[PDB]
Design a protein around this ligand. Structure first.
Ligand SMILES: O=c1ccn([C@@H]2O[C@H](COP(=O)(O)OP(=O)(O)OP(=O)(O)O)[C@@H](O)[C@H]2O)c(=O)[nH]1
Ligand SMILES: [Mn+2]
Ligand SMILES: [Mn+2]
Length: 565
């Protein structure tokens, strides 16, 4: 059983694609070694196809089956609603890809009769037809990176695979409530996406302290999406089907699974057949939910197979953290070998073999880690940080070129307490946004895979919700964190942190000189910048402001939209 089959027709672009950065004063202002920064393109898709195309040998044992039955019994608890066409339409991102059938996301949100009548038609088809493979498009994705310390080798583009806009809206009607509700119900504490960054570090610490002699390790699968077998996707359906479901919801899930999720034909931008998928599609609604469940299940079973004791995992799609009781240095390494041997039998080998860790801080997952800092009162605070290379590289791209998804905004929101996000990112973009009249224009960003639409001037509020107000006061970051940040500036050619401090003094002055929510941006975001730091107090409409069901689940490649909060 092969993950993909190719006819030889190319993965084709729809427009021109820029690779290298353009040299302009504003990006220079941030980053100097321009030629360290690249965007991916169609040209490398070939390469990506090679990494992602293989055969899958799966062998399931009793541990796996036991864990499934356990997961399923929890899933039996769920009652999931069928969404209305309207409800589902309003979950569609305004810039989601337009349909083959003469209407785009705008029309769907407007509930254009062409759109809703097509969607109704696509819905009925899921009820009438139970086997005909549903068309998907395959595209090379445009993502920006910094090149490897390994000379001049670049990641090839990733491949997105997604059904037409009308299918996608149906997917929401059928499966949205499921995909939002079930993972927590089945996986409890282990379900990553139920956690704000603050809550995620909380859970990791409390877990780490709850052990007598702790021992954590990160796991990650070489192309998880290709390792997802047809069987995996039907197992995953069997979990979903344990929900109380509307009859048409049950069939829709039944049809989507056979027709779309287990695989199907791949069409390119030009309309020709590239071939066939027998693994997970990156761009369906159930991708993140599927990946997480599948990973949780395979992982959980692999512990019991390697007799690790008191495992507590955190799962975010493909990304797996595990913290457990240690059996001694030499044992641990041997058990972790066996974990991997199990996962591999379940068709999920790792990129790089897990290595046991005896400090929580050295464990990295979802590209991020726990680091330590202190607040005003000097009492020691835990927060979530990241190697700033890729964030800064993208910040330099989105400065010198208009991007659909403003990644820098996402990172400030998410990594608000971190060193580099405050001193470099915040300063750089509030500088730009002030020069060009544009603090109030709402910008599109991406949190946990869902598209959000946020105004810069609501950042003190938002940051306070997620990380608390202490995220405006942290000051004594760990040596290793400062060492890592500093070495990253040297790599990309970013002016050392000293430099941003005055760029930021100027910068808190511009904002106080303007009142309103603009001023409390200056005051709160840049209290690290003045040497005569004033005190900070819980902002008014700044949590009890706007609330919702935001950070309750992930929708990576799931086409989900929240202007929420
Ligand atoms: O548009 C896309 C396409 C794909 N993906 C997702 O990226 C993965 C492809 O890449 P990998 O799964 O091999 O790398 P990864 O571990 O870094 O993936 P993430 O956890 O960072 O997501 C797949 O698991 C796919 O679902 C997106 O998030 N967006
Ligand atoms: Mn992976
Ligand atoms: Mn991953």
């Amino acid at each position: 059983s092969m993950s993909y089959t190719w006819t030889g027709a190319l993965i084709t672009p729809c427009a021109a694609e820029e690779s290298k950065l353009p040299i302009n004063p504003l990006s220079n202002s941030l980053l100097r070694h321009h030629n360290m920064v690249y965007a991916t393109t169609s040209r490398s898709a070939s390469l990506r196809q090679k990494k992602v195309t293989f055969d899958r040998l799966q062998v399931l044992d009793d541990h796996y089956r036991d864990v499934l039955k356990e997961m399923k019994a929890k899933a039996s608890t769920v009652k999931a609603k069928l969404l209305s066409i309207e409800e589902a339409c309003k979950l569609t991102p305004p810039h989601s890809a337009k349909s083959k059938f003469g209407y785009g996301a705008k029309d769907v949100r407007n509930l254009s009769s062409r759109a809703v009548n097509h969607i109704r038609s696509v819905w009925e088809d899921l009820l009438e037809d139970t086997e005909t493979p549903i068309d998907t498009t395959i595209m090379a994705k445009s993502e920006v990176f910094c090149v490897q310390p390994e000379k001049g080798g670049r990641k090839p583009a990733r491949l997105i695979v997604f059904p037409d806009l009308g299918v996608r809206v149906c997917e929401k009607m059928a499966l949205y409530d499921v995909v939002s509700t079930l993972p927590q119900a089945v996986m409890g504490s282990s379900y990553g996406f139920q956690y704000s960054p603050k809550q995620r570090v909380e859970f990791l610490v409390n877990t780490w302290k709850s052990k007598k002699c702790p021992m954590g390790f990160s796991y990650d699968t070489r192309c998880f999406d290709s390792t997802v077998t047809e069987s995996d996707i039907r197992v995953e359906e069997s979990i979903y089907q344990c929900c109380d479901l509307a009859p048409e919801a049950r069939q829709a899930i039944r049809s989507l699974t056979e027709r779309l999720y287990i695989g199907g034909p791949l069409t390119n931008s030009k309309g020709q057949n590239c071939g066939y998928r027998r693994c997970r599609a990156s761009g369906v609604l159930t991708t993140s939910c599927g990946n997480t469940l599948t990973c949780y299940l395979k992982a959980t079973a692999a512990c019991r197979a390697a007799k690790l004791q008191d495992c507590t995992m955190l799962v975010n799609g493909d990304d797996l953290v595990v913290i457990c009781e240690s059996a001694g240095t030499q044992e641990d390494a041997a058990a972790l070998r066996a974990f991997t041997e199990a996962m591999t039998r379940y068709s999920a080998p790792p990129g790089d073999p897990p290595q046991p860790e005896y400090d929580l801080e050295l464990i990295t997952s979802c590209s991020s880690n726990v680091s330590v800092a202190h607040d005003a009162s000097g009492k020691r605070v835990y927060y979530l940080t990241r190697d700033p290379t890729t964030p800064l590289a993208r910040a330099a791209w989105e400065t010198a070129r208009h991007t659909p998804i403003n990644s820098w905004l996402g990172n400030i929101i998410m990594y608000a307490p971190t060193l580099w996000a405050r001193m470099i990112l915040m300063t750089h973009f509030f500088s730009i946004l002030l020069a060009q009249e544009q603090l109030e224009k709402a910008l599109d960003c991406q949190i946990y895979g869902a598209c959000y639409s946020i105004e810069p001037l609501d950042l003190p509020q938002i940051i306070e919700r997620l990380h608390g107000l202490s995220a405006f006061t942290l000051h004594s970051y760990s040596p290793g964190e400062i060492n890592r940040v500093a070495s990253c500036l040297r790599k990309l050619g970013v002016p050392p942190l000293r430099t941003w401090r005055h760029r930021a003094r100027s910068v808190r002055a511009k904002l106080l000189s303007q009142g309103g929510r603009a001023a409390t941006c200056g005051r709160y975001l840049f209290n690290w910048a003045v040497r005569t730091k004033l005190k900070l107090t819980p902002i008014p409409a700044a949590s009890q402001l706007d609330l919702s069901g935001n950070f309750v689940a992930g929708y990576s490649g799931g086409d989900i939209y929240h202007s929420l909060s």
